[PDB]
């Protein structure tokens, strides 16, 4: 046992006092301060991780400017949302232990993972969970880029499902996440030489293999990759990984003619109509560009026609 006592009482910087529970990287249950101990049941969690940790500071950054549960509810009421997949932030602090200095964070505490569901569902995703899912992480994407951020590492082991409903998806970990318009002032295209990820190999954007700064267009193009994996259960360069100049030049090449991207992802013939639009449309956008969010989503609604559904918000996993 390391960085807490079980059980112990923590108290954030808004004098919000927490209980600590057992583990669940640093990660731990946690619950408000009261005489029951912290059970498995816990709607928080508490992530310690030592203070000079930088993407600790980056994802408190992002929570305490961007997903203040307020601010999110304001967003949630003026869209007309059912909900948004955007984790709420309760608090956060500091706190020693052994002499080293610790930062923590209070969120909410979600589900499993959609990698796991996608690996017992033999690595494939329905055309109506792929359309669902992907609709609510434009609504997130919508939302946190209309904050400054982008996230540049969309994937199913970052999107968790709400500990109590199974229909609402949450994209996860922000401690990459990067501020591409700070005060309304878009990023030069080029490299930021403090930030040093490039996201995941196989989803990550061509902007992120050309060593420049995410902006939206990337966070787009990821979407566009996920939705693939999904559907068909692989990518066309994924027995080539460990070359990302492999990498980038098939999405490169794929990304010049969509319709060859589709002949090699859905063999086949016929390819669902909306994942090539959509494609062609986030292929349109300069870096710089703001999306049209909402002609994104109608590309996908029309997938819910052609498949006799509509958006119900039912993920169907
Ligand atoms: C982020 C990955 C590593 C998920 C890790 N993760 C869980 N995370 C959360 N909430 C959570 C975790 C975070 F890091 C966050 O930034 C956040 F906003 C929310 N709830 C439940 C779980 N469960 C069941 C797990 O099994 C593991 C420990």
């Given at each position: 046992a390391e960085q807490f006592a079980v059980g112990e009482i923590i108290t954030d910087m808004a004098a919000a006092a927490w209980k600590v529970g057992l583990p669940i990287g640093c990660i731990y249950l946690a619950d408000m301060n009261s005489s029951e101990s912290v059970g498995s049941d816990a709607p928080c969690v508490v992530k310690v991780e030592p203070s000079d940790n930088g993407p600790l500071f980056t994802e408190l950054k992002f929570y305490q400017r961007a997903a203040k549960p307020e601010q999110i509810q304001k967003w949630i009421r003026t869209r007309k949302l059912k909900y948004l997949g955007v984790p709420k932030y309760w608090g956060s602090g500091l706190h020693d232990k052994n002499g080293k200095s610790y930062r923590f964070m209070i969120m909410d505490r979600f589900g499993s993972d959609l990698q796991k569901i996608y690996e017992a569902n033999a690595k494939r995703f329905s055309r109506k969970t792929v359309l669902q899912l992907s609709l609510r992480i434009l609504d997130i994407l919508e939302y946190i880029h209309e904050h400054e951020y982008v996230h540049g590492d969309i994937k199913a082991s970052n999107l968790l499902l709400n500990y109590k409903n199974p229909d609402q998806v949450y994209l996860v970990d922000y401690?990459?996440?990067?501020?591409?318009?700070?005060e309304g002032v878009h990023k030069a295209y080029?490299?930021?030489?403090?930030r040093c990820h490039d996201g995941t190999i196989e989803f990550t954007s061509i902007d992120a293999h050309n060593g420049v700064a995410p902006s939206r267009r990337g966070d787009l193009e990821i979407l566009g990759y996920c939705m693939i994996q999904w559907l068909?259960?692989?990518?066309?360069?994924e027995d080539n990984l460990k070359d990302p100049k492999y990498v980038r030049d098939s999405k490169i090449r794929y990304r010049e003619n969509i319709a060859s991207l589709m002949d090699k992802c859905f063999?086949?013939?016929?390819?669902?109509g909306e994942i090539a639009k959509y494609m062609e449309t986030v292929k349109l956008?300069?870096?710089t560009e703001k999306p049209l969010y909402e002609n994104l989503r109608d590309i996908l609604l029309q997938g819910l026609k052609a498949i006799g559904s509509k958006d119900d918000g039912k993920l169907d996993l």
């Open positions: 401690g990459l996440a990067y501020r591409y318009c700070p080029a490299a930021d030489p403090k068909t259960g692989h990518l066309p360069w063999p086949a013939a016929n390819a669902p956008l300069d870096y």
